[PDB]
Structure 1
């Protein structure tokens, strides 16, 4: 074990969006001491992610925007991007649904129509700390690499079919991790993001512990030697992961970490 990667919503975070800081801080100290790395792999924005680790932000690494942005020890390592035409197309397609609310996620900030329901903005504000109102999604001066849709992830099968033809796979629908849908560049998932750090560190999946609970954690869990499904994880995630742990309201993620430090089952 050389790397521990964790999801946030429904994983490392309890339902109230908090975690045992004193406990994780002591653990992290032991992980650092042992040379084991800590990575947060999440669909959330880099800026909201670091808000949860204000004291460790420059030490640990992040795989943000579901794989679109990767920071290694404080430095930006990679970021995907849609071509100007690809984004115009996706945005044009989304705007055809004059009932749909969505967020355009960029390298510098996320963006949302200034004509979006107050309730939608508040929810998105909890996943994107840099959220700017705009008049025209087409006039955004930033590189874009992901979208977040105001639609329950329950409708994913439907979104796949609708966008299959309309976008021909310019982007694929996956769960945001907090009940909604994210449109990502195919291939730019958490596993792909984590792979960039492993290459950088010269480590392999064989040394990776990964913890998750929803659909967007699929390839991350399948990739890792030590894959953990949260007690509250979805069915297909529980199946994919080799191991299990308590739910997010009972420090499931931290128990996996503990097991690593004390060498309890799978580590022994």
Structure 2
């Protein structure tokens, strides 16, 4: 029985150019709604950036933003994570020890970046955080913080992750959201956790869930879902975790999974 379809955005639902087939998806969505199947967007991007992709459906569908740190259901904020003042001060201090590491502080009202960060970095992060405010001091932000995002040479991700895993003693866990992206999240607050909040809400089970993804921060989501799909362009460990597969993001791979649910083809026959 399928009752929920959850999809990642970057490298998944979106093609390399960050667009999707809107008319095709809109028709699929209307049939899903008709069958009473819920649609969920699960991404590490900011809530405000995520809804920019679904302006005409933003209050109907549900969102697991910031990797599960911010969850909306039918247009209403359901939950948000939070780092204590001390925790965030410690994480920021550790990040700052590396004057070569560029990062953004993700909060409930907005994301923040040093007013001294490189222009290319800010322009790049602006594509993932539509609410991004320059700040003089990361330590003086009046908002609830619940995640940090770094951009760095992709080939350096394993070192940094290992290093950060120890230097923060688990206060926050380093995870990869795709090429050149590293997210620091509150332990346990991943996409799978956010999705479960919705399932609990709807009295549904992981057995009724279809999930589609392509990178490290999708691991728990795919392991939890009965119908797990790895995009054709997915990372190796993700292809291994996922039970099923589909075309890559430049060939409507996510929409094809939705189509299989609607037409009952493998694995939904």
TM class, shorter-length = over 0.9
Q: Residue 101 of structure 2 corresponds to which residue in structure 1?
A: 100
Deviates more, 1:172-181 or 1:72-81: 172-181
Q: CA deviation at 1:157?
A: 2.4
Q: Which moved more, 1:58-67 or 1:154-163?
A: 154-163
Q: CA deviation at 1:158?
A: 1.4
- Runs ≥4 residues deviating over 2 A: 152-157, 176-179
Q: In structure 2, the residue corresponding to 1:87 is in which secondary structure?
A: helix
> Are 1:4 and 2:22 matched, yes or no?
no
3-state secondary structure, aligned to 1:78: strand
**TM superposition shift of 1:100:** 1.6
Mapped contact 1:215–1:237 kept (Cα < 8 A): yes
CA distance in 2, matches of 1:222, 1:214: 13
SS in 1 for 2:152: strand
Quote how far apart the aligned CAs of 1:118 are: 0.4
Stretch deviating more after TM superposition (214-223 or 162-171): 162-171
The CA deviation string for residues 84-133 of structure 1, in whole angstroms up to 9 with x for no partner, is 00000000111111222110000000000000000000000000000000
Distance apart, 1:153 and its partner CA: 4.3
Give the 3-state SS of the residue equivalent to 1:77 in structure 2: strand
Alignment RMSD, CA only? Answer: 0.9
| Matched positions, count | 268
SS at match of 1:11: helix
Which 5+ residue runs of structure 1 have no aligned equivalent?
none
In the alignment, is the contact (CA less than 8 A) between 1:66 and 1:188 conserved in 2? yes
Distance 1:82 1:153, change over 3 A: farther
Partner of 2:138: 137
Check the 8 A contact 2:6/2:42 in 1, yes or no: yes
For 2:75 and 2:191, the matched residues in 1 are separated by: 18
Deviations 1:224-264 (A, max 9, x none): 00000001111111111000000000000000000000001
**Residue range with higher mean Cα deviation, 164-173 or 236-245:** 164-173
**Conserved? CA contact 2:165–2:174, under 8 Å:** no
Please, what TM-score do these two structures have when normalized by structure 1? Answer: 0.98
Instruction: Judge conservation of contact 2:12–2:231 (CA < 8 Å) in 1.
Output: yes
Deviation sequence 1:130-168 (CA, Å, 0-9, x none): 000000000000000000012234433212332233210
Report if the CA contact (8 A) 1:156-1:174 is conserved.
no
Contact 1:3/1:36 (<8 A) preserved: yes
SS at 1:165 equivalent: helix
Q: What is the CA–CA distance in structure 2 between the aligned matches of 1:233 and 1:162, rounded to whole Å?
A: 25
Cα deviation for residue 178 of structure 1 reads 4.8
- Give secondary structure in 2 for the equivalent of 1:48: helix
Describe the superposition over 1:25-53 as per-residue Cα deviations: whole angstroms up to 9, x where unpaired: 00000000000000000000000000000
